[PDB]
């Protein structure tokens, strides 16, 4: 490794802990995720549990909120890997996600090492949602399509501006758009890699655990940097 010290933290399998605090339309909920990341493979394997009971939104609408440091950057692209460069002190990731003809998520997380573990600690607020819309009415299929994530430098803030659209299939036919606006800024003082325009290619498989009695999501994701 020769472009950032933080890259060295991602050799082999890294434990992952995700803690999400949410509040949408008067419904408070918590999600806890535990799993492993293999950045050399761009692979995540996580199981998520709603620790507060029933999730009051569809699991697919939380995927993007619930760690881009696990992307596979090919050698010729590794100079562009902001996410690993910020480690171990990590980065703030902030989004507004606009659901077309419905409400928005406002999210803010810290992604950083806590000892051996890569942690995403994140808050979500859901504003202006329709009680009978596709989100609060649970009208979205239990799946997640392939998407590209568009990364741009933000030299002014020593970080990133990121944008992409998620297409959520509606039960019975139709697509619900979720427009993602994102920023990343470092938490620490160390040097970071400010990239050129590039994108991540993201494949996701969500499933259920036969044995699990809690509201939950089994999660498999592969993502790669392309330029």
Author numbering: -1 to 64, 68 to 228
Publication passage describing the model:
We characterized the fitness peaks of four orthologous fluorescent proteins with a broad range of sequence divergence. To complement the available data on the avGFP fitness peak (Sarkisyan et al., 2016; GFP from Aequorea victoria, Hydrozoa), we experimentally characterized three additional GFP sequences, each with a different degree of sequence divergence from avGFP: amacGFP (Aequorea macrodactyla, Hydrozoa), cgreGFP (Clytia gregaria, Hydrozoa), and ppluGPF2 (Pontellina plumata, Copepoda), with 18%, 59%, and 82% sequence divergence, respectively. Mutations in the chromophore eliminated fluorescence and mutations of buried amino acid residues had a stronger effect than mutations of residues on the protein surface. In all four fitness peaks, a threshold effect of accumulating multiple random mutations was found, such that the median level of fluorescence dropped sharply once a certain number of mutations was reached.
We solved the crystal structure of amacGFP and analysed it along with structures already available for other proteins. By contrast, the fitness peaks of amacGFP and ppluGFP2 were substantially flatter, with each tolerating twice as many mutations. By contrast, few genotypes with >5 mutations in flat fitness peaks required epistasis to explain their fluorescence level, with amacGFP requiring almost no epistasis at all. Indeed, the two closest sequences (82% identity), derived from the same genus, are the sharp, epistatic avGFP peak and the flat, non-epistatic amacGFP peak. Therefore, we performed an array of assays aimed at the biophysical characterisation of the four wildtype proteins and an additional genotype, amacGFP:V12L, which differed from amacGFP by the V12L mutation that was extremely common in the amacGFP mutant library. Specifically, we observed that the most mutationally fragile protein, cgreGFP is also the most kinetically unstable protein and the most mutationally robust protein, ppluGFP2, was also the most kinetically stable. These data tentatively suggest that the shape of the GFP fitness peaks, as characterized by mutational robustness, may in part be shaped by the underlying protein stability. Peak analysis is consistent with the following oligomeric states for each gene: amacGFP: primarily mono- and dimeric, with small fractions of tri- and/or tetramers; avGFP: primarily monomeric, with a small dimeric fraction; cgreGFP: primarily dimeric, with a small tetrameric fraction; ppluGFP2: primarily tetrameric, with a small fraction forming large aggregates or oligomers. The propensity for aggregation also appears variable between the genotypes, with amacGFP showing the highest aggregation of non-fluorescent genotypes. Interestingly, the V12L mutation in amacGFP:V12L appears to have shifted the distribution of the mutation effects, substantially increasing the effect of mutations on the barrel lid in proximity to residue 12, without impacting the overall mutational robustness.
